[PDB]
Design a protein around this ligand. Structure first.
Ligand SMILES: CC(C)C[C@H](NC(=O)[C@H](C)NC(=O)C[C@H](O)[C@H](COCc1ccc(Br)cc1)NC(=O)[C@@H](NC(=O)c1ccccn1)C(C)C)C(N)=O
Length: 325
């Protein structure tokens, strides 16, 4: 390989994780790798909440490269919050490292119960600068500016449960991860990796929809009216929504563009829950409303489609992911 590759591990076809290190002594952490975010945080030894107790806890006194900051910070996500302070230290992703500004989280109460139930320690954001808190240049943009990579781009080939591992790749595109053509879609905003596409489910449409490609999200989210229209006379029961996995009325998402066509079928957006019951699926689709009608294409989408996030060309590339390497 001529690129930096970091292996991704699956967690029951819902979420995936990847490891990176912080500190010149390479203390290991498990991260959500999140193109929907623009900050890096790890839980600190100074964390006082209960969630932190089983986590890998970052200790700045072990790194000669640590550089104090201390500015207080709260990190807000759609479905939780963590707080702490800024610090700077060597951050290492695959085999590339750089001095980088990140957050030492000391309070995780705003992430519970998910945090304690899950195996990740922190989050490693991979969005654009203006999405970040504390005005911090993206890791991959810095690598480029520091001449540690030649191309400011990264790709996601997601893992599938009991089939194969995945790869986050920084610095170039590897044909081995995908099949059929690679189509590029220009960002509508240098913020999230968000592009404009026409959405169609049944006889429902949203032209010029804002679509966030978000690796740190374990569902597809749609605007709530759009969801309600999708649910009409569909044989699903509002408990989050449960359906028979073979429910023949379950529609296919279509997203079209100037020069690309992408689909998402029920087999990708159904979160099998066959331990609640035999032939039983969760709709892995959530209603969520932003100022402008938005779709978040999360893990279900990125599990089907290989993706490229190119900062130099301000665009996202999309292709069918190879079913097996
Ligand atoms: C709330 C906004 C007004 C604030 C906004 N902030 C952001 O836009 C931040 C930077 N990014 C995001 O919130 C999107 C991220 O991709 C985020 C990543 O978080 C994952 C996450 C969240 C909560 C727990 Br617990 C564990 C893991 N995904 C999510 O929060 C998704 N949740 C989930 O995927 C999820 C998965 C598992 C458990 C709980 N939630 C969500 C989109 C549906 C802003 N303007 O600064």
């Amino acid at each position: 390989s001529s690129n930096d590759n970091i292996e991704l591990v699956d967690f029951q076809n819902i979420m995936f994780y990847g490891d990176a290190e912080v500190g010149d002594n390479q203390q290991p952490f498990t991260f959500i790798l999140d193109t929907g975010s623009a900050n890096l945080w790890v839980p600190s030894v100074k964390c006082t909440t209960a969630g932190c107790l089983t986590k890998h806890l970052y200790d700045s006194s072990k790194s000669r490269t640590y550089e104090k900051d201390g500015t207080k910070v709260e990190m807000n996500y759609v479905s939780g919050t963590v707080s702490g302070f800024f610090s700077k230290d060597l951050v290492t992703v695959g085999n590339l490292s750089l001095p980088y500004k990140f957050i030492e989280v000391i309070d995780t109460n705003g992430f519970e119960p998910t945090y304690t139930a899950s195996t990740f320690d922190g989050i490693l954001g991979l969005g654009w600068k203006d999405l970040s808190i504390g005005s911090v240049d993206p890791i991959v943009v810095e690598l480029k500016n520091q001449n540690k990579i030649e191309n400011a781009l990264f790709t996601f080939y997601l893992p599938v449960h009991d089939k194969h591992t995945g790869f986050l790749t920084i610095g170039g595109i590897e044909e081995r991860f995908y099949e059929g053509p690679l189509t590029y879609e220009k960002l509508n905003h240098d913020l999230y990796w968000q592009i404009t596409l026409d959405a169609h489910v049944g006889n429902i449409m949203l032209e010029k929809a804002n679509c966030i490609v978000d690796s740190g999200t374990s569902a597809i989210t749609v605007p709530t009216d759009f969801l309600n229209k999708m649910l009409q006379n569909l044989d699903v029961i509002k408990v989050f929504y449960v359906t028979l996995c073979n429910n023949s009325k379950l529609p296919t998402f279509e997203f079209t563009s100037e020069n690309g066509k992408y689909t998402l079928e029920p087999e990708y957006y159904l979160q099998h829950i066959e331990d609640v019951g035999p032939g039983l699926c969760m709709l892995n689709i959530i209603g969520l409303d932003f100022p402008v009608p938005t779709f978040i294409l999360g893990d279900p989408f990125m599990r089907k489609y290989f993706t490229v996030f190119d900062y130099d060309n301000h665009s996202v590339g999309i292709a069918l992911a190879k079913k097996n390497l």
